[PDB]
């Protein structure tokens, strides 16, 4: 528990240092700001365009020309400025759909990663997901995904089953493994070797059916009580 707590506290410290140093981490949120800024700046700059009118400025047309020709020059501006809005609103509707897909994903990560423990591989970050913490950000959310990563392999010889007195034994949980001379049973995701027993194993049928079965004694905890 002290190791797990120290690794968590150290990993949260690395988040502070990463975010303090590296402003480019937030690039998804800063780009959504930049896209909306570039769209409004483009919409404003399109007021400066003539669209074939004698001037970009509506008051030049209304001060230089009288209504029989002024309305032809104004309609050139109305046509291009309405096409300028229709382009902006179309691209904001498409960008709003992109953001809604991202918000629906973030709402799903809130329910499944924060309010739960997701079994879904890489949904709540790399490694086996333990839990997640939400943090707010400008126009977005940040999830601090906490995950178990298995870290220090050893190679073991292994078997699908053990032959005892003609019966084939399989692990109830985990796998059979050998240090080279002794056989143990262990959980799959962390090396914790146990003696192979009638409690750690279940029987099914005889030794002939299983490809790669190995002979080893399976200890029965009742036998030494009956010897006693």
């Amino acid at each position: 528990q002290k190791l797990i707590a120290n690794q968590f506290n150290s990993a949260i410290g690395k988040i502070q240092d990463s975010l303090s140093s590296t402003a480019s981490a937030l690039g998804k949120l800063q780009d959504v700001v930049n896209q909306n800024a570039q769209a409004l700046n483009t919409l404003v700059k399109q007021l400066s365009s003539n669209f074939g009118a004698i001037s970009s400025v509506l008051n030049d047309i209304l001060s230089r020309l009288c209504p029989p020709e002024a309305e032809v020059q104004i309609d050139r501006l109305i046509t291009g400025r309405l096409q300028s809005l229709q382009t902006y609103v179309t691209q904001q509707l498409i960008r709003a759909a992109e953001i809604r897909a991202s918000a629906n994903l973030a709402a799903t990560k809130m329910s499944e990663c924060v309010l739960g423990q997701s079994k879904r591989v890489d949904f709540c970050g790399k490694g086996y997901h333990l839990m997640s913490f939400p943090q707010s950000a400008p126009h977005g959310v940040v999830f601090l995904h906490v995950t178990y990563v298995p870290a220090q392999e050893k190679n073991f010889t292994t078997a699908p089953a053990i032959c005892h007195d003609g019966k084939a034994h399989f692990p109830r949980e985990g796998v059979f493994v050998s240090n080279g001379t002794h056989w143990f049973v262990t959980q799959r995701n962390f090396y914790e070797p146990q003696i192979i027993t009638t409690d750690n194993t279940f029987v099914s049928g005889n030794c002939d059916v299983v490809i790669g079965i190995v002979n080893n004694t399976v200890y029965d905890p009742l036998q030494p009580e009956l010897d006693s």
């Binding site: 797990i4 990993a11 988040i15 970050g125 906490v146 392999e153 010889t157 292994t158 790669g212």
Partner: protein, 73 residues
Amino acid sequence: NVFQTRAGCLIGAEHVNNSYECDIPIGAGICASYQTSQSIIAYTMSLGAENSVAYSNNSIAIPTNFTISVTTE
């Protein structure tokens, strides 16, 4: 300094026989980066480190220790 990529003719980039993570994507496997007297180099991007998994019909790897990782999305 003149290099035919499958994306087109690339000029002013030093073609290099090493491979690296993609810095600036040029296309069709080519990327460019600024590297060491410095130059813009161009290279075929590396997909990752290569790994022959130690598989056999009776060998298993089991982790003896773990690391708690915190990753930011």
